[PDB]
Scaffold this motif. Structure first.
Motif, short mmCIF file in Angstrom:
data_model
loop_
_atom_site.label_atom_id
_atom_site.label_comp_id
_atom_site.label_asym_id
_atom_site.label_seq_id
_atom_site.Cartn_x
_atom_site.Cartn_y
_atom_site.Cartn_z
N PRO A 49 21.94 28.12 88.65
CA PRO A 49 22.98 27.20 89.15
C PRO A 49 23.66 27.56 90.47
N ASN A 50 23.85 28.86 90.70
CA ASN A 50 24.52 29.36 91.91
C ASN A 50 23.56 30.09 92.85
N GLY A 51 22.30 30.17 92.44
CA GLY A 51 21.29 30.84 93.23
C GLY A 51 20.19 31.40 92.36
N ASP A 52 19.25 32.11 92.98
CA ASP A 52 18.11 32.71 92.29
C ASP A 52 18.46 33.87 91.35
N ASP A 53 17.81 33.92 90.19
CA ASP A 53 18.03 34.98 89.21
C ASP A 53 16.81 35.88 89.09
N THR A 54 17.00 37.18 89.33
CA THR A 54 15.91 38.15 89.20
C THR A 54 15.96 38.74 87.78
N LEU A 55 14.90 38.47 87.02
CA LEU A 55 14.77 38.92 85.64
C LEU A 55 14.13 40.29 85.46
N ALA A 56 13.25 40.65 86.40
CA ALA A 56 12.55 41.94 86.39
C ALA A 56 11.97 42.29 87.76
N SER A 57 12.55 43.30 88.40
CA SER A 57 12.07 43.74 89.70
C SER A 57 11.37 45.09 89.59
N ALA A 58 10.75 45.49 90.70
CA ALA A 58 10.05 46.77 90.83
C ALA A 58 9.84 47.09 92.30
N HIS A 59 10.36 48.23 92.71
CA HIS A 59 10.24 48.73 94.08
C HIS A 59 9.23 49.87 94.00
N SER A 60 8.64 50.23 95.14
CA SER A 60 7.68 51.33 95.17
C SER A 60 8.40 52.68 95.25
N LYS A 96 6.83 42.90 101.17
CA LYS A 96 6.37 44.19 101.68
C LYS A 96 7.10 44.64 102.94
N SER A 97 7.35 45.95 103.00
CA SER A 97 8.01 46.61 104.13
C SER A 97 6.98 47.57 104.74
N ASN A 98 7.37 48.24 105.82
CA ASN A 98 6.51 49.20 106.53
C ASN A 98 6.19 50.43 105.68
N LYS A 99 7.22 50.99 105.07
CA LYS A 99 7.09 52.17 104.22
C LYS A 99 7.00 51.84 102.74
N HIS A 100 7.60 50.72 102.33
CA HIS A 100 7.62 50.34 100.92
C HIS A 100 7.06 48.95 100.55
N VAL A 101 6.99 48.68 99.25
CA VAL A 101 6.49 47.42 98.67
C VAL A 101 7.36 47.03 97.47
N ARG A 102 7.84 45.79 97.46
CA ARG A 102 8.70 45.24 96.40
C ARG A 102 8.05 44.05 95.66
N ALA A 103 8.35 43.93 94.37
CA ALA A 103 7.84 42.85 93.53
C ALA A 103 8.89 42.38 92.51
N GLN A 104 9.45 41.20 92.75
CA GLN A 104 10.48 40.61 91.88
C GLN A 104 9.95 39.45 91.05
N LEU A 105 10.59 39.22 89.89
CA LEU A 105 10.25 38.11 89.00
C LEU A 105 11.50 37.24 88.99
N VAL A 106 11.46 36.21 89.83
CA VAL A 106 12.59 35.31 90.01
C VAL A 106 12.52 33.93 89.34
N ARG A 128 7.72 45.19 83.06
CA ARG A 128 9.16 45.01 82.88
C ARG A 128 9.46 43.55 82.54
N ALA A 129 8.57 42.66 83.01
CA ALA A 129 8.66 41.22 82.78
C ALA A 129 8.30 40.85 81.35
N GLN A 130 7.34 41.58 80.77
CA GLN A 130 6.91 41.35 79.39
C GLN A 130 8.00 41.74 78.40
N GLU A 131 8.79 42.75 78.76
CA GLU A 131 9.89 43.22 77.92
C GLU A 131 11.17 42.40 78.07
N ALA A 132 11.14 41.44 79.00
CA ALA A 132 12.26 40.54 79.27
C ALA A 132 12.02 39.21 78.55
N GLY A 133 10.75 38.90 78.31
CA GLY A 133 10.36 37.67 77.63
C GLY A 133 9.56 36.71 78.49
N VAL A 134 9.25 37.13 79.72
CA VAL A 134 8.49 36.34 80.69
C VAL A 134 6.99 36.43 80.37
#
Ligand SMILES: [Cl-]
Ligand SMILES: [Cl-]
Ligand SMILES: [Mg+2]
Ligand SMILES: [Mg+2]
Ligand SMILES: [Mg+2]
Ligand SMILES: [Mg+2]
Ligand SMILES: [Mg+2]
Ligand SMILES: [Mg+2]
Ligand SMILES: [Mg+2]
Ligand SMILES: [Mg+2]
Ligand code: NA
Ligand code: NA
Ligand code: NA
Ligand code: NA
Ligand code: NA
Ligand SMILES: [Sr+2]
Ligand SMILES: [Sr+2]
Ligand SMILES: [Sr+2]
Ligand SMILES: [Sr+2]
Ligand SMILES: [Sr+2]
Ligand SMILES: [Sr+2]
Ligand SMILES: [Sr+2]
Lengths: 154, 160, 140, 186, 95
Positions: free
Chosen positions: D52-63, D38-48, D91-97
């Motif tokens: 192998p080289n770092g974190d993978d975001t499969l489905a995100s959503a910003h406000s 969460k930010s001051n003006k906005h809110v974010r929600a990622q599905l990570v 968005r996560a359900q349509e990715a297979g999560v």
RNA sequence: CCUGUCAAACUCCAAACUUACAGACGCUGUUUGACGCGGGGAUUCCGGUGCGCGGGGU
RNA sequence: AGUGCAAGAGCAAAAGAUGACUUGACAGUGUUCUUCCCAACGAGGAACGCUGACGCGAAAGCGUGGUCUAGCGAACCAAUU
RNA sequence: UUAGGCGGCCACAGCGGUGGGGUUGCCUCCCGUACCCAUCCCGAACACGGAAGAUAAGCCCACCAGCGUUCCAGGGAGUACUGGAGUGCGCGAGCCUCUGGGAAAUCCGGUUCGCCGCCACC
């Protein structure tokens, strides 16, 4: 391609060094093998450096040695030009000798014993207690220096 | 005790004072001699006493050789003369003695010694050109009180 | 530039280091809010063998509660130059300490992605004196 | 910094962005993380998920991408927080999560907060996340009824830019309805 | 030895180099290995749990299944075959 | 600042080398059956010397 | 620094401190390593699982005592559940 | 990535420093406590609500090597040490030749003021 000759016996010599000589198909003193110049074979001759005599022989000397001391894989048969012609992929001793030096084939591959069982050096060698640079007969030799040894061991 | 018992480097490095207790004080009175206020580069001549063999010299041999060397310089150049001698080696190696047969043989601490390798400088004196033959004589007396043979090498002097 | 650089009062900490309590009543009357006890560490030979025991009290004042206190607190003491911090704070005395700083101190007091305030944005002893002098009193 | 012996913390700890002790305990499950930031003006929600080289975001959503569906109201509040979570979960359900674990990062586990709203939204979207019903806010605060009862204490308007006067928490219901519908372009 | 404890003669191998001090990264503690995979055994000094006997440091075993989160790794100590229970935190993939 | 020394129970460094596994070459095994497994019978548990590295001790 | 006690080792949004809640210092049964390198050998020990029941936490999760390596004992007999 | 989110490696990324950057955009500082929540006292923090103002902090961008760090050149050094060999030398401690490896300190000169992954976003 180098020619190894064991000049020092098995007694008091390290097991891992004696075992390397047996892997290089050389079991007795005065026995000789024709070893290729690869990384794997280089580590093996460096380990035996103090109990052996090596160097690249001349086409002419290798020919003489093969004529007088090469034997079949099994048997007494003389390895002359006629023998070479009937069993090997070459025509005469010279053809075999060239291929061995250019590392195209091996003695075993051609139905010959990997070992050339030589005669003791005529007029004797330069000694088994010192290397070549110090006046002895151990280690790496010149192409002329190894020939003197191999020819003396006809 | 003779130096034969302690001259060679055969035992391990035994210097750790946090594990060794009852170590006798150093018989060495001074390490910086002569004019210790003046610098080494202020003198034209620099002659060192070089130890030829790798040895272990006791604090008593170090004191005897230093005392018989500096006493010659105090005699020939004066008490406040224009020279400065330095003993660069310090007695770190703690020595034992088994003084009961061979049972519980680890000895009690009797002294200290300095490990000097072959070719190293034990003493180094800085003098002027006129006092060069007096210091070569101070070292001639100093080498007679240690274990190895020595070299009196001139490191800064083309005045011959 | 000047609006986000002009100093302000962060906290006015009023403490009384007694040694063994009864003095909690006089602070709530002069400040306006509730005080808290003060504990101590390490065993001292002045009959102070207990660790978790009330030795004193303190009150931290914010915003209005801080300025409505300083209107009556500053005339009670003669302010000096050697009475200042290198960070631009001052203590006088009943101890009264005023913490002064620039408009972006949250960056060092927050939880998420906190960073320490750079030397240039930190308050100077001289920059602090000038701010208080510009509000009903004299320096030196 | 001082010398060779000195130990400089890991980059994301030096930056004070990642709690590595909580990160290990989070990754121990094997399920993807529902990164609720969460930010001051906005809110974010990622599905990570882990890579192998770092974190993978499969489905995100910003406000910010919430307005694309019909949001005319602010983006850093309780109704927006739930809806960002619901949008992330869909968005996560349509990715297979199918399942996830809530990562709040350096935020506090305060009862009824925006990060728990992000969690309630993702669960409602059809995702299986280990939760606690009584730590989540009551259905009306999620709607934004606390903001409407603050606008009842009017005199001076709460919102500067014209959205409305007395506030509409019915907009939440109008958007939850749009997202529950399967036709929607995700 | 003076004592036959498990941590005897382990001053060096169970100590970290000053810059490798503090808590270890989670990426290698969560790492997933498959059956048949060759793994290197090295204890992470910063991680207390899931360790093996320090005598087995430097062994290149073969993952042959798992017990909970920890792995069952097969090694050959001298001439005797042993199965070691070890977590990912103390394992590195060969090549 | 400058100047003088050290460490079996110090280490910002750091070999030679030893060592796990794998591939390759070599050697070896598939009538001389290796590797491995099961069983019968032991002897043996006063050792010594050289060399290398040691620890104690003049 | 502290972390009960040798020494060596581990730990900083903690393994330390504070505070609050709590009793997993739980029952049952194993796997493996150690004890005993290699290489057989008991008691003891540790790591790692499963079943049961719980504690805490938003939750992932953590708790098979104390951060790790010492603090231990056969058969017979007695007492106890 | 005209300033974002989650990371991997975990200082080549540290310490210190200079310059630049934000009208309905982003991140912030910022404004503010009716509520969810909060402080052993403090809407400081945490939590929540919001945009009057700002680019001064942070952050993002460009850059500087003085300290710390990484690697490279050259010098030190094929020195120190060392695996294998010797009817080689030395009273001896010890050394030497041949063969196969091969440092460390330090000085000089470069390098390094992070690299890479996933996602979102004029
Ligand atoms: Cl956040
Ligand atoms: Cl084990
Ligand atoms: Mg035959
Ligand atoms: Mg004759
Ligand atoms: Mg002779
Ligand atoms: Mg050691
Ligand atoms: Mg009895
Ligand atoms: Mg009883
Ligand atoms: Mg600027
Ligand atoms: Mg001799
Ligand atoms: Na006796
Ligand atoms: Na670590
Ligand atoms: Na047992
Ligand atoms: Na209290
Ligand atoms: Na800025
Ligand atoms: Sr000795
Ligand atoms: Sr002498
Ligand atoms: Sr060894
Ligand atoms: Sr434990
Ligand atoms: Sr405020
Ligand atoms: Sr003698
Ligand atoms: Sr080389």
């Amino acid at each position: 391609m180098h020619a190894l000759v064991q000049l020092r016996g098995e007694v008091n010599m390290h097991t891992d060094i004696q075992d390397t000589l047996e892997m290089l198909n050389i079991h007795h003193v005065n026995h000789c093998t024709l070893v290729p110049e690869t990384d794997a074979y280089r580590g093996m001759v460096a380990k035996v450096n103090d109990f052996v005599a090596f160097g690249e022989p001349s086409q002419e000397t290798l020919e003489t040695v093969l004529a007088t001391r090469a034997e079949p894989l099994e048997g007494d048969a003389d390895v002359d030009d006629e023998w070479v012609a009937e069993h090997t992929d070459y025509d005469d001793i010279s053809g075999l000798a060239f291929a061995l030096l250019s590392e195209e084939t091996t003695l075993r591959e051609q139905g010959l014993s990997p070992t050339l069982r030589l005669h003791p050096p005529r007029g004797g060698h330069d000694g088994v207690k010192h290397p070549v640079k110090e006046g002895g007969q151990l280690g790496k030799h010149d192409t002329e220096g190894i020939d003197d040894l191999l020819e003396a061991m006809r | 005790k003779p130096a034969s018992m302690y001259r060679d480097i055969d035992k391990p490095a035994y210097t750790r004072r946090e594990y060794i207790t009852g170590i006798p004080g150093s018989k060495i009175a001074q390490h910086k001699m002569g004019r210790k206020q003046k610098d080494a580069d202020d003198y034209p001549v620099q002659i060192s006493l070089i130890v030829e063999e790798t040895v272990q010299l006791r604090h008593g041999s170090l004191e005897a050789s230093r005392l018989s060397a500096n006493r010659h310089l105090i005699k020939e150049l004066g008490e406040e003369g224009d020279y400065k001698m330095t003993l660069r080696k310090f007695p770190h190696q703690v020595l034992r003695e088994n003084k009961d047969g061979m049972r519980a043989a680890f000895g009690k601490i009797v002294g200290t010694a300095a490990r000097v390798q072959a070719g190293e400088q034990l003493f180094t004196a800085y003098c002027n050109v006129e006092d060069a033959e007096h210091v070569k004589e101070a070292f001639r007396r100093a080498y007679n009180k240690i274990t190895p043979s020595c070299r009196i090498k001139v490191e800064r002097g083309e005045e011959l | 530039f000047h609006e986000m650089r002009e100093p302000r009062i962060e906290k006015v900490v009023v403490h009384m280091g007694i040694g063994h309590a009864n003095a909690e009543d006089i602070l709530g009357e002069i400040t306006g809010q509730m005080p808290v006890r003060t504990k101590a560490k390490r065993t001292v030979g002045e009959f102070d063998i207990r660790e978790g025991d009330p030795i004193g009290a303190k009150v931290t004042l914010r915003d209005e509660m801080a300025e409505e206190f300083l209107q009556t607190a500053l005339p009670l003491a003669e302010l000096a130059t050697s009475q200042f911090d290198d960070t631009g704070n001052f203590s006088f005395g009943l101890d009264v300490t005023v913490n002064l700083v620039r408009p972006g101190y949250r960056v060092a007091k927050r939880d998420k992605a906190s960073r320490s305030i750079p030397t240039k944005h930190r308050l100077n002893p001289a920059d602090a004196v000038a701010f208080i002098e510009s509000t009903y009193d004299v320096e030196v | 910094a001082t010398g060779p012996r000195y130990k400089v913390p890991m980059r994301r700890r030096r930056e004070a962005r990642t709690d590595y002790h909580q990160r290990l305990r989070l990754l121990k499950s094997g399920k993807p993380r529902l990164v609720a930031r969460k930010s001051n003006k906005h809110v974010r929600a990622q599905l990570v998920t882990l890579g192998p080289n770092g974190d993978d975001t499969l489905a995100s959503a910003h406000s910010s991408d919430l307005a694309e569906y019909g949001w005319e109201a602010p983006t850093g509040n309780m109704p927006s927080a739930y809806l960002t979570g619901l949008l992330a979960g869909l968005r996560a359900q349509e990715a297979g999560v199918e399942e996830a674990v809530l990562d709040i990062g350096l935020n506090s586990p305060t009862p009824g907060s925006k990060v728990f709203a992000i969690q309630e939204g993702a669960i409602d979207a059809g995702l299986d996340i280990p939760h606690n019903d009584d730590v989540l806010a009551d259905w009306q605060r999620t709607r934004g009824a606390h903001i409407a009862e603050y606008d009842e204490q009017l005199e001076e308007p709460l919102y500067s830019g014209d959205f409305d006067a007395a506030d509409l928490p019915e907009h939440f219901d109008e958007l939850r309805e749009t997202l529950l519908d399967g036709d929607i372009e995700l | 030895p003076s004592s036959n404890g498990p941590l005897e003669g382990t001053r060096g191998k169970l100590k970290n180099k000053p810059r490798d001090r503090g808590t270890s990264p989670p990426q290698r503690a969560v790492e997933e290995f498959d059956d048949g995979e060759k793994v290197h055994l090295k204890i992470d000094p910063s991680v207390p749990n899931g360790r093996f006997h320090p005598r087995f440091d430097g062994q290149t075993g073969t993952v042959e299944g798992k017990q909970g989160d920890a792995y069952k790794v097969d090694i050959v100590d001298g001439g005797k075959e042993k199965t070691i229970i070890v977590t990912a935190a103390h394992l590195r993939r060969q090549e």
